Amino acid sequence: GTSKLKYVLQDARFFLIKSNNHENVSLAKAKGVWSTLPVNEKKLNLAFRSARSVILIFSVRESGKFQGFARLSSESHHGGSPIHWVLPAGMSAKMLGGVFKIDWICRRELPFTKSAHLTNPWNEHKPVKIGRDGQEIELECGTQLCLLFPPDESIDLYQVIHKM
Numbered sequence: 001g002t003s004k005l006k007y008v009l010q011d012a013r014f015f016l017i018k019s020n021n022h023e024n025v026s027l028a029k030a031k032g033v034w035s036t037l038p039v040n041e042k043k044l045n046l047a048f049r050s051a052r053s054v055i056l057i058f059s060v061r062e063s064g065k066f067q068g069f070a071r072l073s074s075e076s077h078h079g080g081s082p083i084h085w086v087l088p089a090g091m092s093a094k095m096l097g098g099v100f101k102i103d104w105i106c107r108r109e110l111p112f113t114k115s116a117h118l119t120n121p122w123n124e125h126k127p128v129k130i131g132r133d134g135q136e137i138e139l140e141c142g143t144q145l146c147l148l149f150p151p152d153e154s155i156d157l158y159q160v161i162h163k164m
């Protein structure tokens, strides 16, 4: 059911994550990590301290879809093992230096056409698919977006709930 999911999403904060390629989202799903540009890294570290849950909602650029969503389980940590990201043009491996641990809540896709009725107050009420990497999504919009995803029955939210 959706009861444990709703419990995880209670009073959460939501951020849109944009990836230039599928490879990095696949790597994030396999290894349970994400890295983003320094400006967004600061915002996520601030959010992680402030909310019961911080939810990253992933979308690969030009894919027309969201690829799933995950919960931060840590602040960014540097110096550690180097993740073999595929780097876009103008992206250096030092900009993606900070590494967040994440717990996936849903690894299923959602097409943008299915979220056309959801607008984001924190981005001028543009459709929620619209936003730069790191755009915050207001609570009610983010909650309804996450509830539109197909259920991912391979994930037990029981361990997720305990981290809180």
Ligand SMILES: CNc1nc(Cl)nc2c1ncn2Cc1cc(Cl)ccc1NS(C)(=O)=O
Binding pocket: 018, 019, 020, 021, 024, 034, 035, 036, 037, 061, 085, 086, 087, 088, 089, 090, 091, 096, 131, 132, 133, 134
């Ligand atoms: C592992 N982390 C990432 N991997 C990949 Cl492939 N793309 C990412 C990642 N983080 C953010 N982006 C998107 C991005 C890339 C570049 Cl070079 C310049 C700006 C932006 N932000 S934007 C304009 O909204 O798309």
